[PDB]
Amino acid sequence: AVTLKWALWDWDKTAYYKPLIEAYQAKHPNVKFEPMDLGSQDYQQMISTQLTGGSKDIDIVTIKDVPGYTNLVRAGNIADLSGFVKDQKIDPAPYGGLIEELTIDGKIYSLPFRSDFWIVYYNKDIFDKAGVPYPTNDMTWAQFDETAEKLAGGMGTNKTYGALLHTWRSTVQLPGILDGKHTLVDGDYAFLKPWYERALTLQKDGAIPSYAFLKTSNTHYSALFFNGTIGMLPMGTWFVGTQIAKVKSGESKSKNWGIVKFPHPDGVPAGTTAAQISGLAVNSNSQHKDAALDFIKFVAGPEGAAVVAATGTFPALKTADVSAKIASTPGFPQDEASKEALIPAKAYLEMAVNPNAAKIEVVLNRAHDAIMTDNTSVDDGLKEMTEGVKAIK
C-alpha cells in the first residue's frame, strides 16, 4: 500500500490525469495517488520550492516544458533515468528523436508523455474553389509558397489568403532547423536568411496576413482559419482538437479540412518537424522510487499513450496504435494523407536544452519583430540575434 504524490498543473482542465490514474490503479490497486496541483502560471517556481530542503513529499514530478526540465536538472531535483530506460529496454524510436533531444551529457531525467509537433492544416473548400489539388505529405517550402501564392486572391467574399504565418518567431524560424545543421540556441543566426526572405515575400505580396496587422489587431491564427479565408496554416498539432471542437460547435466554418506533414527544406525527409514536450520525472528524494518509476513508464509508454490520445491530446509516443486512436476521433479528417501525417519522421525540439533559453527568446523575439515590421533589414536583424545572444550573461 503506497500513496504517490504527483505534482502537476491544472487538474480540473486537464482531462488525462484522472483516466491515467484509474487505468494504472485498475492494474495496481495498492498504489493510490494524491495529485498536488501547483498551478500553471509559474509552475516551474512552485515545483522548485516544493523540492527544496531535500523534501520527499513529492514522488512524481511533471515537467511542463524544456526550460522546466533544464531547471530541474540544474537544481539536481530529479533522478537520472538512463539505467532504468536501458534495463527496461524502452525503445526510443517511436518518440521520434525526443529521447536523444532530452539527453544531457549521456543522461536522461524525464520520460516524455505528450508532444505536439508542427504540421500544416488546410481548408479543402479553398483548394476546391480554386481548382488547386490538396497539399501532399511531401512538400518543399518552395512548393508551399507557390501554392499559397496561387490560392491568394479574390475580391470581397472571394478574398482569401493562401496561408497564415502566425506572429510567433517560430512560424518563420522553425523551417530553418529542420535540416539538423543549426539550432536556435547557439552561435550564428545567418542561416535564417532565406527563411526570412520567403516569409517577407509572402507578406509583401499579400499571400498571407501581414505581421504588423496581426500584431496591432492581436488576431489569433485560429480566428482567421475559422473564418474560412486561409488556405494553409502551419501550426502545432494542438490545433487538431481545437478545430474538431469548433467545427462541431459551428464556430469554425472551415468544416472541410485536412492535415499534411510539415513541409521540408530541399534534401530533408518529409515529415521532419519540430516539437514541444511535457514529461514525467521522479523526485531525487522520493522514498517510493520503484513505484514512481513504474507509473512514469506506464504513462509515457503505449498504454498511457492510448489514454492520452483518447482525450484528444497528442502523446509523445507516435505509433500505429496512437495514430488509429487519434484518427478515429469523430471529426478528424478521414483522408489517408491526414492519418499518415500523425507519425513524424523525426522531431527536433523547438528550443534545445539551454540554461539561457528565456533570455535567448527575448533577443530573438525583438529582432524577429523588427524584421517582420520592415524596421531592420534581414541581415541586420540576424546580426542582432547573433550578437545579442553572445552578450547574454
Number of neighbours of residue 160 by Cβ within 10 angstroms: 19
Q: Is 73 exposed, middle or buried (0-12, 13-18, 19+ CB in 10 A)?
A: buried
> 195-198: long-range contacts at Cβ-Cβ below 8 A with a sequence spacing of 24 or more?
196/172, 196/371, 196/378, 196/381, 196/382, 197/378, 198/141, 198/142, 198/145
Q: What angle do CA 190, 193, 198 make, to 5 degrees?
A: 165
Instruction: Name the minimum Å distance from CB 103 to Cl ion.
Output: 15
**Quick one: cell of 33?**
495517488
Give whichever of 114 and 368 is closer to Cl ion, judged by the CB atom: 114
Instruction: Name the minimum Å distance from CB 62 to Cl ion.
Output: 13
Give whichever of 238 and 335 is closer to Cl ion, judged by the CB atom: 238
Greatest CA separation found in the chain?
A: 69
Instruction: Name the minimum Å distance from CB 14 to Cl ion.
Output: 16
Q: Give residue for cell 500505429.
A: 320
Give whichever of 6 and 141 is closer to Cl ion, judged by the CB atom: 141
Give whichever of 21 and 81 is closer to Cl ion, judged by the CB atom: 81
Give whichever of 273 and 276 is closer to Cl ion, judged by the CB atom: 276
Number of neighbours of residue 197 by Cβ within 10 angstroms: 12
Query: In the chain, where do the E strands start and end?
Result: 2-8, 31-37, 60-63, 103-104, 107-108, 111-123, 161-163, 230-236, 257-261, 272-282, 346-349
Positions touching Cl ion (CB under 5 A) are 65-66, 140-142, 265, 276-277
Instruction: Name the minimum Å distance from CB 215 to Cl ion.
Output: 24
Give whichever of 103 and 329 is closer to Cl ion, judged by the CB atom: 103
Distance, CA of 163 to CA of 144 (rounded, Å): 9
Give whichever of 69 and 257 is closer to Cl ion, judged by the CB atom: 69
368 Cβ partners below 8 Å, 6+ apart?
A: 169, 172, 173, 381
Instruction: Name the minimum Å distance from CB 207 to Cl ion.
Output: 16
Instruction: Name the minimum Å distance from CB 140 to Cl ion.
Output: 4
Instruction: Name the minimum Å distance from CB 43 to Cl ion.
Output: 13
